[PDB]
Amino acid sequence: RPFRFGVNLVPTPGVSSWRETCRTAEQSGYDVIAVPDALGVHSPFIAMMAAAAVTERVQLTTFVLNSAFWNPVLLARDLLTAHELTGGRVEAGLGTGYVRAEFETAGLDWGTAGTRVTRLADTLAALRTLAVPTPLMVGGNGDRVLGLAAEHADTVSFSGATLRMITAEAMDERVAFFAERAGERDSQVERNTLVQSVIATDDRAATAKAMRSRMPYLTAEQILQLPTLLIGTPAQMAETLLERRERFGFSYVCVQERYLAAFAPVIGLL
């Protein structure tokens, strides 16, 4: 599947640079602007509308909605609106939330991991029943969550962390688990991952060795294979993404805002 590149931008209250940042993302060659769903961050669909007003090509996605925050019928109303009023430029990533304090602040029941995943399941079923027109992305690494992606999603997003970084070998197993659950639908589901750090260096080996300090549970060789890290020159990173599309099927690759400019050269090469 052809590469699609995203940058995960944080629209921040009290900061006046949102539209400028979105323009920079598009001008730097990104295909997608992703926004989070968190307290103390701008509201996602409203921020996506502001981004759509100053960009022409990028898709806009949530990455990812906290399912505890949304009534499925009212979310379907939001998604239909966002789709129609942007000319079909909005995608909706959904998942579970991991910050209990946000549940507490909003007056929502934290419950159990089981009830949080059931809420995601119930929302996805309702959105599909209501035939929402936005493409749906499901993110996580849990067995039930990947099963829900396999059943419902247009795009599955594999987390490269639990932050504890997951090895390439663990990622092999998660992608295979998803693929088995997806069955005949596997080929219709785009695969995404988020790269946490884009580390430009002329000495990847020396860089990985020093990084064992921050990831003592890994060898340097494992660090150089972690799907959540890109290390080296732009040419080396481009080659690494080609290899990881072959290995994992990852064609939709996102990076964090801090690395927007660091990663842009890789887009130029790919």
Author numbering: 25 to 186, 196 to 303
Q: Which lines from the publication concern this structure?
A:
Central to this pathway is PepI, an F420H2-dependent oxidoreductase. PepI first catalyzes the formation of the central statine, then produces the C-terminal statine moiety. Among these, the homolog kvPepI from Kitasatospora viridis DSM44826, with 53.3% sequence identity to PepI, was more amenable to study. Through comprehensive structural and biochemical characterization of PepI/kvPepI, we confirmed that PepI/kvPepI sequentially reduces the middle β-ketone followed by the C-terminal β-ketone or methyl ketone.
Overlay of Adf-acetone adduct structure with kvPepI-F420 revealed that the keto group of the acetone adduct occupies a position similar to that of the ordered water (HOH570), suggesting that the highly conserved His62 acts as a general acid to protonate the keto group of 9. Accordingly, the H62A mutation abolished the PepI activity. To rule out the possibility of H62A mutation causing a loss of activity due to allosteric effects, we also solved the structures of kvPepIH62A and kvPepIH62A in complex with F420, which are virtually identical to kvPepI apo and kvPepI-F420 complex structures, respectively. Taken together, these findings strongly support the role of His62 as the proton-donating residue. Site-directed mutagenesis and kvPepI-9 modeling studies support the role of His62 as a potential catalytic residue, as corroborated by the abolishment of enzymatic activity regardless of whether 9 or 13 were used as the substrate.
